[PDB]
Amino acid sequence: LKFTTEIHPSCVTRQKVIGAGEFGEVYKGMLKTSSGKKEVPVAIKTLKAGYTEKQRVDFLGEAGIMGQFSHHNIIRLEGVISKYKPMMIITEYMENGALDKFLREKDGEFSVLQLVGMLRGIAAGMKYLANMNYVHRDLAARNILVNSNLVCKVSDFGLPIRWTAPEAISYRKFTSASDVWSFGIVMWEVMTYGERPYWELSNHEVMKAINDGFRLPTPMDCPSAIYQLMMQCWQQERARRPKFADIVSILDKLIRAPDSLKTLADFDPVSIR
Ligand SMILES: Cc1cccc(Cl)c1NC(=O)c1cnc(Nc2cccc(C(=O)NCC(C)(C)CN)c2)s1
Numbered sequence: 001l002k003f004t005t006e007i008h009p010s011c012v013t014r015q016k017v018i019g020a021g022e023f024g025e026v027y028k029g030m031l032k033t034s035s036g037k038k039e040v041p042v043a044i045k046t047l048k049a050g051y052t053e054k055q056r057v058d059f060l061g062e063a064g065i066m067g068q069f070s071h072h073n074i075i076r077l078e079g080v081i082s083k084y085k086p087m088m089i090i091t092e093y094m095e096n097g098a099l100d101k102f103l104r105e106k107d108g109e110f111s112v113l114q115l116v117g118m119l120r121g122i123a124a125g126m127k128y129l130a131n132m133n134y135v136h137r138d139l140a141a142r143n144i145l146v147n148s149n150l151v152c153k154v155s156d157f158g159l160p161i162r163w164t165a166p167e168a169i170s171y172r173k174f175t176s177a178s179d180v181w182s183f184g185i186v187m188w189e190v191m192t193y194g195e196r197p198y199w200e201l202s203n204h205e206v207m208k209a210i211n212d213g214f215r216l217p218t219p220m221d222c223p224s225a226i227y228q229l230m231m232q233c234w235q236q237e238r239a240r241r242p243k244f245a246d247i248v249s250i251l252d253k254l255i256r257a258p259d260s261l262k263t264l265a266d267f268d269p270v271s272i273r
Contacts, residue, residue: 004067005079007031007090012081014044018097023055024048024086031078031090041093042078046086056087058158063089065157068132073125075145075155094155095148100141104194112223112261115190118152119226120251122190125154126183127244130176137174139163139182141189161203166210167238177238183247184233191219191226210234218265225254227265 011032019026024046031042047059066077066089081088096102099118122144129136136143136154140163143156165181167173185197197216198206215234218227229250235241242250254260 001064002068002070004063004077006083007079007081007088009081009084012042012044012088012090018043023051023059028093033078040078042090043093045089045091047088048086059087059089062157065134066091069128071125071128073121073151073153074128075153091155092147094145094153096146096150098142099144099146099152100189100194102146102194103141103190107193112221113255113258114150116223116226116251116255116261118146118150119187119190120248120255121152122154122186123183123244123247123251125152126179127248129154130179130244135174135176136179136182137168139179139186141186141194144186162197162201162206165238166207166236169207175238176244177241180233180241180244180247181238183244184230185216187226187230187233188216188219191222195219218267220267222265222267223254223261224263224265225250225260 012029014027014029016028017025018028025048027044027046029042029044031040032038033040047055051059060080060082063077063080066075070076075094076092078090078092080090126136126139136157136159138156138159139154140160143154144152145155146152161169163182163185165178168175168178168181188197189195198209201209213236215231229242229247232240232242233247
C-alpha cells in the first residue's frame with residue numbers, strides 16, 4: 001500500500017471554514033511542505049473529539065484509499081494528522097467546490113465542449129478507479145470537485161437511489177458496471193447544470209420508472225452522441241453498458257472532431273403557441 005504522509009500540526013494553518021457537520025468541519029488553509037521550502041493551499045477535514053471507533057475507521061480509511069491514487073482527475077491527498085487531535089485529512093484545495101453546486105450557480109454559462117471536457121475528466125478518473133479495482137458506489141456530481149481551471153476530480157471516497165443501478169438497488173451488486181450507470185446520471189447532471197435527477201419523483205417512483213424502461217429525457221442543448229452515450233450507461237442489463245475505457249474513448253473522439261457535437265438530440269418541450 002502507498003504511504004500516507006503524517007503531517008506535523010505546526011505545518012498546517014486553518015484560515016476559513018468551508019463546511020461543517022456533526023463529526024467535524026472542513027477548512028481552507030495552508031500547508032508547509034518540502035521541509036519549509038514550499039507552501040500550498042489545502043482543504044482540511046477534521047474529526048472532533050468524541051468520535052467512535054467506526055467513525056475513526058471510516059475517516060482514516062477514506063484517507064488511506066485516497067492515498068493509493070495518483071491521477072489528474074482524482075483529488076490529491078497531502079497527508080493526515082493522526083498522532084494529534086483533532087485528527088485531520090489534508091487534500092489539495094479545489095477553488096470552485098462541488099460540481100453540482102458549481103453548475104447550479106453557473107447555469108447556461110459554459111459551452112457544450114466545456115461540459116463534455118468535464119465529463120471526459122470525470123470518466124478518466126473513474127476509469128483509473130475501476131482499473132485499480134475500486135468501486136465507488138456513490139458517484140454523483142456532489143462528490144466531484146472543481147478547481148479554478150475547471151478540472152473535475154473524483155473527490156469523496158467515504159463509501160442514494162436515483163444515482164444507483166437497478167441491480168445494486170435490488171441485490172447490493174455494486175461493481176464498476178453499476179458505477180457506469182451512475183456516471184450516466186452524472187452526465188445528465190452536468191448537461192443540465194445540476195438538475196435533480198427525475199425531478200419531483202420519490203425514490204419509489206424512480207424505481208418504478210426505471211424498471212418500466214423509462215429513462216431521463218434529454219437535457220436542453222445536448223449533443224445527440226452524448227445523450228446516446230448516457231442512455232447506453234443506463235442499459236438494464238449490465239453487460240450491455242460501456243466500460244469506462246469505452247466512455248473515455250468515445251468522449252475523446254467527440255472532442256477531437258468537435259463538429260460531431262453540433263448534432264443535438266431533440267429537446268422535447270410545455271406547449272406555447
Ligand atoms: C479535506 C478532504 C478530506 C477528505 C475528502 C475531501 Cl474531498 C477533502 N477535501 C475537500 O473536501 C475539499 C477540497 N476542496 C474543497 N473546496 C471547496 C468545497 C466547498 C466550497 C468551496 C468554495 O470555496 N466554494 C465557493 C463558494 C461559493 C462556496 C464561496 N466560498 C470549496 S472541499
